[PDB]
């Protein structure tokens, strides 16, 4: 898991290696720039000091002339550094951008060259996160951090070299102090660089119950765990709060320690330097230049660690992409060493074919199948689901290879001939097709390259899918939505048949081509299928026997092996399995957030005080620095000079200690108030969303994951929106206001001159800060807005592995990649220019300020201590203003966040779950009466699913509801359970209308089983224990319900039997077992009204009886309503209701519906026996 460095710089041109070399040279130059500026600064301040000393003796002419000369060194260094910085940044960014574009295109090629078996095992999203995260990490690992790394190493080396060639004594002292300085700068950059992932994990620990309660929305009011899930969520928030508090405390400890160390080093270095300057051994400019070069060098070598971090990350993230690109499959679509026939005649040969799925290789579905199919032979295969008809279809197109035997098509085997040429000539429709979300002309064009619209019209008229083309607008320009959601299912399957038929194939393979289709359209589709079957070989897999009776050969699967063979009458005169089949068939808010942290006002007041002191900490440094220099700018007694120097060293130390305390306090207090606000806001938004109705979440914009992300991000952004603006404003005021004032008092002219520069210096500071770690994410946003095509061509590997059109989607990916690449190059150039210009203006401020200062000193208008004060108080004031106002989070998105949070908190549901008001009778009977009830979905207001049904249910009346899939089966459940209230109709619950009753009482009395069993992230004892709430749950009822649901055996078998931790949605254990535990979880409710919705969807035949015996012994006393597709619970039901498009067609006893032969008898004579 550590790529060798040479392997990553693969895909590098010669132009890119030239870019890298020249960028490294420019980076070294721009790095070594700064210690030379310190050199010139030392020489210049020495000039000023000697002029002052002499003019205080003779009690200023050559001063102006020598400053004239030094301005030229300043300007030269400024220009050279501007050029070197521009070159370094632009060249490194261009090299990395082009290299990463090449990497990404070649990686997509590799991820396309694979096979479905290698793609069906790995997760689909895994490759998505691999692409985005891995590629962006490779980009940042080689983009610029190498530039800044070499620049910081150059600054360190040149700084120590200058410090040694000037004076080696103070240099050895600052060297002895240097390792702790480097460590402090490294840790301080390390904690300011990321500031996201640790708090993200601290919240992710709690994101589990978030995803729990937002992944189980419907069943959560039946479970009624709102109070309990809210308690557990409060616990998780408490732990997250404690971890975040410890984070803030330790981070601010490290910050304060770094600043205390900086200031103690200032104190020691000035103490020793002034000892030498007073002992005549050193000058003041010399001590200044030696100290500034060594201190800056140590800080830079400290700041060059995140480059190493990002490079290690880039190697680690490139390992997997290189392994993907490195892998070559046995069969390559791109490879042209495959063999291609010419006289392609339809002949199928399978002999001794054994194959198992590599996802589950322990189970063997197939145990040998031998077939020989001639041309024009319509072969159908019949059998139950589990034998693998779809397995045989996937075995045909060489999606895999059989482990035993050899398959052949017309003499020669598949294993020596080309895969793509074979893949284009077999037109296959799968069971559930997928449609790409383009126009329908492109969709029907997707078979082959050069198809004109006349062949399109002939193919769609063969498919009989031109009428719905005729009725909708944009008859070749209609953009079908995601996964065929815009159109209906029958139009979708008919145009899918068209999309296969445009290839003009040699072998046609249909797999369940008429699942959701009606009578006449399946008829005309099958007539068209016999219109094009005479030149081709065909295999049809279907459930309806209307299209099977007119075939050539019928065959039957049993346990994977094809057992029966022959024509219709041969299987009819043999009375086999199939015999039994045919015999049976015949914004809005503006700063109302100030009151959100109001209760923690001591934190706010101590924070504003500490911010005032931490802002004013700068002009005090200006004062002490200028005073300690002016002590050596004038003449005085040696002892007075030594006393002043010692006093100012002590003042440096004391200022450092104050800085430590105040940084700790401000950081801790603001972080603590922020975290308390985030906790109080997450708690409240979760409670207010739990108080909502099901109609609220069912809104199309109110999605689960989107809402957990809204919580995670906005509840942490609104804390900044309130605390950070105030803290930063106060910091910047106490930093720059008193600075401009003290400057105006002493030097009036130079203060105006530098006022004409402070904005650009602040801008340079903010830019340098945004460059230290993290500038912009917009490139990811462009790639994402253009990245859905790779997602869709990855997920739907199925259609692309057969259509033989992979290169077209690779070219589409290239067309998607083109324009962001041009924009990235233009942005690299612009960014280089801006960075260089800002740093150069920071380099030219020296020259301007000190030339005007020399002209002022020469004319007696001010001293040198004064110009030093104005400089160090105004220019560094503006630089600190920029540096600090950078770390502040921006304000517009924070405001939008607070607005939406307050909106959602403020929103109140029409029905309140916490209120007790309503009709509370002490008694009931258990009779339900629906009358003229109509319901339309709020997300689909134009489409009515109901047209006024009615129903009468009495005590103990086993009421079966039978109908088509999607005719309002669970809608009556949702009308009962107070999810949706209908616009019209009347529902009487024992002569008591549900709209006037208590809301929680109806949700307490009844108890259902969901359409899909969902459990929570705990053990099975807490799975069944969720069924009864606000009540002391007895374990005797737990074991009694586990015995009654016949899940007691599977619980008592498991180790840690009632403490066995179940994962998400019961993904560890099987579907029948979680269905039985859903039966046990509903069973503890003991409901007076019981509903079942698909009680035997995935369950064994011996388990259905042991589920139903508890139901039949407990159906007395309670009203029972079962909805299922299996007829075994429908035969013994009391009254049976058949639905048709929401309308009640037949009702009454089962013998009455069996007497009058209608649509129910149609479904009652399918598998009667």
């Amino acid at each position, epitope marked *: 898991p550590t790529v060798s460095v040479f392997s990553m710089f693969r895909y590098s041109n010669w132009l890119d290696k030239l870019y890298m070399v020249v960028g490294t040279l420019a980076a070294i130059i721009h790095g070594a720039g700064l210690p030379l500026m310190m050199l010139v600064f030392g020489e210049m301040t020495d*000039i000023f000091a000697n002029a002052g000393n*002499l003019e205080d003796l003779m009690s200023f002419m050559n001063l102006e002339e020598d400053m004239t000369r030094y301005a030229y060194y300043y300007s030269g260094i400024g220009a050279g550094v501007l050029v070197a910085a521009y070159i370094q940044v632009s060249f490194w960014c261009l090299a990395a951008g082009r290299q990463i574009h090449k990497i990404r295109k070649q990686f997509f090629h590799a991820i396309m060259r694979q096979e479905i078996g290698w793609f069906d095992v790995h997760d689909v999203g895994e490759l998505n996160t691999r692409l985005t995260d891995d590629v962006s990490k490779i980009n940042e690992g080689i983009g610029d951090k190498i530039g800044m790394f070499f620049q910081s190493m150059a600054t360190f080396f040149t700084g120590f070299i200058v410090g040694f060639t000037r004076g080696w004594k103070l240099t050895l002292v600052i060297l002895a102090i240097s390792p702790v300085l480097g460590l402090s700068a490294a840790v301080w950059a390390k904690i300011l660089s990321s500031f996201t992932d640790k708090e993200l994990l601290a919240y992710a620990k709690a994101g589990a119950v978030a995803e729990e309660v937002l992944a189980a929305i419907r069943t959560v009011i039946a479970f009624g765990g709102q109070k309990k899930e809210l308690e557990r969520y409060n616990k998780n928030l408490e732990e997250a709060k404690r971890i975040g508090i410890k984070k803030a405390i330790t981070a601010n400890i490290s910050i304060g320690a770094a600043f205390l160390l900086i200031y103690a080093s200032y104190a020691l270095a000035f103490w020793y330097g002034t000892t030498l*300057v007073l002992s005549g051994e050193y*000058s003041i400019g010399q001590v200044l230049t030696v100290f500034f070069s060594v201190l800056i060098g140590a800080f830079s070598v400290g700041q060059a660690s995140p480059s190493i971090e990002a490079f290690a990350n880039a190697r680690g993230a490139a390992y997997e992409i290189f392994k993907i690109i490195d892998n070559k499959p046995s069969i390559d679509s791109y490879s042209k060493s495959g063999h291609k026939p010419d006289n392609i005649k339809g002949n199928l040969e399978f002999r001794n074919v054994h194959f198992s799925y590599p996802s589950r290789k322990e189970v063997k579905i197939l145990k040998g199948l031998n077939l020989k199919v001639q041309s024009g032979q319509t072969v159908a295969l019949v059998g139950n689901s589990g034998c693998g008809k779809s397995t045989t279809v996937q075995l045909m197109q060489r999606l895999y290879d059989p482990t035993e035997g050899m398959v052949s098509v017309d003499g020669q085997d598949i294993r020596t001939i080309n895969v793509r040429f074979l893949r284009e000539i077999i037109g296959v429709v799968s069971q559930e097709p997928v449609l790409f979300a383009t126009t329908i002309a492109e969709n029907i064009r997707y078979g082959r390259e050069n198809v004109t619209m006349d062949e399109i019209e002939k193919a769609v008229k063969e498919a009989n899918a031109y009428d719905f083309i005729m009725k909708l607008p944009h008859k070749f320009d209609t953009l079908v939505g995601e996964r065929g959601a815009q159109l209906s299912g029958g139009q979708k399957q008919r145009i899918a048949i068209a999309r296969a038929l445009v290839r003009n194939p040699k072998i046609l393979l249909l797999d369940e081509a008429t699942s959701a289709l009606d009578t006449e359209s399946e008829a005309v589709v099958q007539v068209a299928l016999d219109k094009a079957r005479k030149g081709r070989t065909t295999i049809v897999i279907a459930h309806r026997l209307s299209t099977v009776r007119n075939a050539d050969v019928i065959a039957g699967f049993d346990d994977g092996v094809i057992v029966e063979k022959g024509n219709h009458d041969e299987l009819m005169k043999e009375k086999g399995i199939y015999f039994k089949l045919v015999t049976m068939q015949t914004p809005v808010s503006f700063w109302r957030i100030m009151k959100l942290n109001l209760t923690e006002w001591p934190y706010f007041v101590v924070g504003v005080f500490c911010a005032i002191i931490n802002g004013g900490l700068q002009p005090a440094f200006a004062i002490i620095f200028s005073k300690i220099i002016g002590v050596f700018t004038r003449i*005085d007694d040696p002892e007075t*000079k030594r006393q002043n120097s010692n006093l100012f060293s002590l003042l440096f130390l004391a200022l450092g200690i104050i800085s430590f305390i105040t940084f700790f306090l401000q950081g801790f207090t603001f972080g603590k108030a922020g975290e308390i606000l985030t906790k109080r806001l997450r708690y409240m938004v979760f409670r207010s969303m739990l108080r909502q109705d099901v109609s609220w979440f069912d809104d199309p914009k109110n999605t689960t994951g989107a809402l957990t992300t809204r919580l995670a991000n906005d509840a942490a952004q609104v804390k900044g929106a309130i605390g950070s603006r105030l803290a930063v404003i106060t910091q910047n005021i106490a930093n720059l206001g008193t600075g401009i004032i003290i400057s105006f008092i002493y030097g009036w002219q130079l203060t105006l001159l530098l006022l004409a520069i402070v904005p650009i210096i602040a801008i340079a500071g903010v830019v340098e800060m945004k460059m230290l770690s993290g500038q912009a994410l917009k490139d990811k946003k462009e790639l994402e807005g253009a990245g859905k095509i790779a997602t869709e061509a990855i997920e739907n590997f199925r259609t692309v592995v057969s259509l033989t059109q992979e290169q077209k989607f690779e070219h589409m990916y290239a067309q998607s990649l083109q324009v962001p690449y041009r924009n990235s190059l233009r942005k690299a150039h612009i960014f280089g220019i801006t960075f260089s210009f800002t740093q150069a203006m920071m380099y030219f401020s020296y020259a301007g300020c000190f030339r005007f200062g020399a002209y002022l000193v020469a004319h007696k208008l001010m001293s040198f201590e004064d110009v030093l004060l104005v400089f160090s108080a105004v220019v560094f004031g503006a630089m600190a203003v920029g540096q600090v106002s950078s770390f502040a989070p921006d304000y517009a998105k924070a405001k939008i966040s607070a607005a939406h949070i307050i909106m959602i908190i403020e929103k109140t549901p029409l029905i309140d779950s916490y209120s007790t008001e309503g009709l509370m009778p002490n008694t009931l009977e258990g009779n339900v009466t629906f009358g003229e009830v109509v319901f339309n979905y709020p997300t689909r207001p134009d489409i009515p699913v109901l047209q006024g049904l009615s129903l009468e249910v009495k005590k103990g009346q086993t009421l079966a509801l039978v109908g088509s899939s999607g005719c309002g089966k669970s809608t009556v459940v949702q009308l009962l359970e107070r999810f949706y209230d209908p616009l019209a109709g009347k529902v009487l619950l024992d002569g008591k209308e549900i709209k006037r009753l208590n809301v929680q009482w109806l949700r307490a009395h009844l108890g259902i089983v969901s359409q899909e069993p969902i459990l929570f992230d705990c053990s099975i004892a807490e799975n069944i224990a969720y069924g009864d709430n606000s009540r002391v749950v007895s374990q005797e009822e737990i074991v009694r319900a586990a015995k009654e649901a016949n899940i007691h055996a599977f619980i008592e078998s498991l180790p840690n039997k009632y403490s066995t931790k179940v994962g998400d949605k019961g993904t560890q254990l099987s579907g029948g077992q979680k269905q039985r535990i859903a039966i046990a979880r509903a069973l503890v409710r003991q409901p007076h009204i019981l509903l079942l919705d698909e009680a035997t969807s995935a369950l064994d035949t011996e388990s259905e009886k042991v589920v139903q015996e508890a139901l039949d012994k407990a159906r007395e006393g309670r009203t029972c309503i079962v909805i299922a597709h299996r007829l075994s619970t429908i035969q013994n039901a009391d009254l049976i209701v058949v639905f048709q498009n929401g309308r009640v067609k037949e009702h009454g006893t089962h013998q009455q519906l069996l007497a009058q032969k209608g649509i129910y008898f149609s479904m009652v004579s399918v598998q009667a026996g």
Partner: antibody
Amino acid sequence: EVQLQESGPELVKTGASVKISCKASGYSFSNYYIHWVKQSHGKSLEWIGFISCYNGATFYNQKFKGKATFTVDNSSSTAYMKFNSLTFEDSAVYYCARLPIQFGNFYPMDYWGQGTTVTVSS
Amino acid sequence: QVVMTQSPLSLPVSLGDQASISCRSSQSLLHSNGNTYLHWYLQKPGQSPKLLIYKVSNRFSGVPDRFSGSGSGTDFTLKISRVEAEDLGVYFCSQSTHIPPWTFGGGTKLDIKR
């Protein structure tokens, strides 16, 4: 441990020019001023002037201005004093002395040159 | 333009007893800051003058402590304790508080008093 030493005697004739040399070792030349001081025979010492060893700026006593020129050589760490048309009154012993630049007359002349006696003769 | 006057132009001293040399300034040798600058140097025949006692009463690093100096206003004095035979030369004083032109004294030689 600072050691300045001078050239040595120079028996020159009237109306001529002579250069006197003070060589300083063992310390930082860039800081101190070098002070030139005259001493006739059997009389009190007399101050001639000072040369800034840093950039070469000078100051002359009123009597001696226009009769003496001070120069400095940094790479050689030496100071030079030259007369112009020296008379009979300039036969004396001359001294160079050290004085730091930070203190500036609040400190003594710590270290002295050994002294080189000039003599005018025809 | 202060004018120092070193009282004895020669001091007949023996070896084993002590002497005292005194300088009188024509002006007050205090300073506006509050310190007095009057340094005493020693010169030997054919050598360079050394610094014996700088400032008011302070002693230069690298000299013994036999030498001492006390004074006030416009009258100062040096004192040699346990006089030896090596520390027999010319002395002089030097004013530095009013320095347009530096001022020195006339000096004093010592004797052996035979």
